Amino acid sequence: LTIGNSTITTQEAANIIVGYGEWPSYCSDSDATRPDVSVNRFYTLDTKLWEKSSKGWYWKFPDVLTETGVFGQNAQFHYLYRSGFCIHVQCNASKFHQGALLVAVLPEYVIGTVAGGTGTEDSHPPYKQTQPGADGFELQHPYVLDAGIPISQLTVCPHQWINLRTNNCATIIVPYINALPFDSALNHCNFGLLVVPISPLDYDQGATPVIPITITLAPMCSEFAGLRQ
């Protein structure tokens, strides 16, 4: 893609999947400024440690981007925000590497904490358990994903499978999907990113024990809108 000073090469001979094949539409109800010069540069999320004992990572959107990045600082001005997400997952392995990673996006993924004892009596999640920042937290038991959701039923939603054999990278376009076009920004959780490997990483001794996995995102439809309050 060549727009301005940006010059990158990607593979256009992959399986590009779009959710239900429908771009977001604009609302026309009555119930009630797009800078893309220094904001359109591609952002690379910090690399995760893909390792044999790695259990997976989860991220709440756009909760983790409310303040952390440039998206955070220019969302600190506008009360509302809505844009498309460019999923960018790539596999970098040699002829001696094995594995199979499953990546999916689940709208309205509810988080569940731990609650032991005979009597059901739960408290409210604290600040760090609700948003741990960029540090993240490794799933203790991904077989039901630390939330009572077993892996066997994650396929019911639009999904795709990652086989590192033929692809070198995968790009997924998920449109701005929501039940209410006018909704809160810092309150409602639109969706979350779950990366659950199926085949654990396998390699003989001598190779690099960690594979650098890259996550990149770009605003497909930058629209802050809203009003100053």
Partner: protein, 164 residues
């Protein structure tokens, strides 16, 4: 609240003693919540309903003295955000210039739209203190009036009267 001061409820005065201050913050546009809203006919109307969503405009007509001059400034705050701290804080947001020679130019401009206290309020701040020359009175009265727009609707009817 006493019976000995119920006569001047209808009108409120403006004083020249205040300089670059703040007169009053108009309460949140909630026809259901008690206060000045329920005294209005529109508030009594909405008192029998449950939900209400819309954008409100508050018009002011200037009634100072003939030789009085100055600039008064109106600004609206988006919902969610708190009350502006200072006149500068009100100015750094959406701002509308009101001249005393033009009465009805006021219009509703929305601050911003987002894609997702509970509701915001509109406030007035003293840009310039009220000034009159020698021989003119230093106080006056201002009248506030509100109306309903086309986008004001209710969907559900239910019989609920709190008084009496």
């Amino acid at each position: 609240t006493n019976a000995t001061s119920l006569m001047e409820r209808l009108r409120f005065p403006v004083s020249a003693q205040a300089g670059k201050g703040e007169l009053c913050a108009v309460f949140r546009a909630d026809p259901g919540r008690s206060g000045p809203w329920q005294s209005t006919l529109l508030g009594q109307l909405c008192g029998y309903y449950t939900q209400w969503s819309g954008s409100l405009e508050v018009t002011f007509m200037f009634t100072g003295s003939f030789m009085a001059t100055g600039k008064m400034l109106i600004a609206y705050t988006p919902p969610g955000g708190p009350l502006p701290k200072d006149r500068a804080t009100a100015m750094l947001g959406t701002h509308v210039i009101w001249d005393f020679g033009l009465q009805s130019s006021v219009t509703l401009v929305i601050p911003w739209i987002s894609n997702t206290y509970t509701t915001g309020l509109v406030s007035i701040w003293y840009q310039t203190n009220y000034v009159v020359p020698i021989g003119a009175p230093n106080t006056a009265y201002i009248i506030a009036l509100a109306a309903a727009q086309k986008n004001f609707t209710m969907q559900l009817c239910k019989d609920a009267s709190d008084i009496l």
